[PDB]
């Protein structure tokens, strides 16, 4: 059996795993530099076939589910999701876990208004001036937007900062060792299980409260009210607090850390490039000069802000690696992929291929304007949202959310970096990328 190209290093206890934890991007870049479109690296006991370049990526995203499986490519997601969603009906995968029902187009306008309200509640006590930490702020804000939009305003209204803190701990229990076993006796895996337990308790607390004093309107009952009333065969409540919480956690995940970090970086890039920031301000002031609401404009064109978003997403994709499990043997550029092999594509690396994106390390929102339109011409390499079969179905909502949040923030306050521009960075120590702290920013009301 012929060996596939293998990148240098990887002599630590778990091969390349250790380096993947400290510098996954640098590692993946060295794979392409040394190996080309098809290279590999060892992740503990599993070999990862990393595909880069337009041709290999295409094969990767167009592959059928019968060929490249996404189902077991993220073992680190198993302990978070927990016992399969509340409804046992075949693969609820993305169907229920991330039902497009939530992001349905009929409710889109509604969501924008919900998002507007969440931002205002979040900056309600800002006053004329002060400071914030982007991770704390955006991580909390997105817990509110995701819960209010994906579950119900009623439910969100009963949440506070504690839910965000614990949910964060949940997200941090995704160390790469999860590819060895997501249940190893790791400290972060223990803190993860303890966090999930804390979440179940907060929900159980809410369930009780709602049972002691139900709604004075059989109209204002949310999803939780419904699940609480579901009775088993003998009259007993059918769902426990753990079951309900596990489903709520599963649904919110999709609307949390990817939006959270993306909101943080969008602002960061705006501050780093005051000219783009100035263009966005002008555009928003002029655009909202028609008197229409944020729920109106978030669902419509805001070009400058959108190109700043697309560029933020190219340089800082939330998911730096995408995974699949090969369910058969395939040939890609003369290299053989075997059943069981882990197959990956990297938005982090692909989004910066020099030949596809002139000056890949520069912030150039113009890339997406009339001329170049580099996102649409590099359909297999511009991949912040993935591509093909598993293309992010929440893209439209994610973008609407960014338009909504910044339509409120940039028109009410001005932002300045409170630390060196280069000090802002991501923590890539976990499979779930998070913005690193400190990430301090100053604000002052606009005149
Ligand atoms: C700007 C923030 C977001 C980014 C960068 C992002 C990125 C991505 C990426 C790269 C994938 C591909 C995963 C893979 O190929 O294995 C994906 C998939 C997905 N995303 Fe997002 N996403 C974002 C927001 C959202 C939101 C807000 C939702 C809905 C709550 C959502 C729902 C989904 C779903 C359901 C999939 C699975 C698609 C499939 O497997 O067919 N995403 N996303
Ligand atoms: O793709 C994710 C899972 N994931 C893989 N690597 C890191 N996180 C995240 N995500 C992507 N967009 C939004 N959330 C996902 C996909 C579908 C889903 F229903 C939940 C879920 F967490």
Coordinates of N, CA and C and ligand atoms in Angstrom, one line a residue, residues 70 74 76-77 81 94 97-98 250 253-255 257-258 319 321 392 431-432, ligand 2:
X70 N -19.7 13.0 7.0 CA -19.5 14.0 7.9 C -20.0 13.6 9.3
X74 N -16.4 14.7 13.5 CA -16.2 15.6 14.6 C -16.6 15.0 15.9
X76 N -15.6 15.4 18.7 CA -15.6 16.4 19.8 C -17.0 17.0 20.0
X77 N -17.9 16.8 19.1 CA -19.2 17.3 19.2 C -20.2 16.4 19.9
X81 N -23.5 17.6 22.3 CA -24.8 17.3 21.8 C -25.5 16.4 22.8
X94 N -29.0 18.0 11.4 CA -29.3 19.3 10.8 C -30.8 19.5 10.4
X97 N -31.6 19.0 14.6 CA -30.5 19.7 15.4 C -30.4 21.2 14.9
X98 N -30.5 21.4 13.6 CA -30.4 22.8 13.1 C -31.5 23.0 12.0
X250 N -27.8 21.8 21.5 CA -27.5 21.4 20.2 C -27.9 22.4 19.1
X253 N -25.8 25.8 19.3 CA -24.4 25.7 18.9 C -24.2 26.4 17.5
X254 N -25.0 26.0 16.6 CA -24.9 26.5 15.2 C -25.0 28.0 15.2
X255 N -25.8 28.6 16.1 CA -25.9 30.1 16.1 C -25.0 30.8 17.1
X257 N -20.7 30.2 18.5 CA -19.3 30.5 18.3 C -18.9 31.0 16.9
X258 N -19.5 30.6 15.9 CA -19.1 31.0 14.5 C -19.5 32.5 14.3
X319 N -14.3 28.2 11.4 CA -14.0 26.8 11.3 C -12.8 26.8 10.4
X321 N -10.9 24.2 9.9 CA -10.7 22.9 9.3 C -12.1 22.2 9.2
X392 N -22.7 25.9 4.2 CA -23.5 26.4 5.4 C -24.9 26.8 5.1
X431 N -10.7 22.6 19.1 CA -11.3 22.4 17.8 C -12.3 23.5 17.6
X432 N -12.8 24.0 18.6 CA -13.7 25.1 18.6 C -13.0 26.4 18.8
Ligands
LIG2 O1 -20.1 22.7 11.7 C1 -20.6 22.8 13.1 C2 -19.8 21.7 13.9 N1 -18.3 22.0 14.0 C3 -17.4 21.5 13.2 N2 -16.2 22.0 13.5 C4 -16.4 23.0 14.5 N3 -17.7 23.0 14.8 C5 -20.3 24.2 13.6 N4 -21.0 25.2 12.9 C6 -20.9 25.6 11.6 N5 -21.7 26.5 11.4 C7 -22.5 26.8 12.5 N6 -22.1 26.0 13.4 C8 -22.1 22.5 13.1 C9 -22.8 22.1 11.9 C10 -24.2 21.8 11.9 C11 -24.9 21.9 13.1 F1 -26.2 21.6 13.1 C12 -24.3 22.2 14.4 C13 -22.9 22.5 14.4 F2 -22.3 22.8 15.6

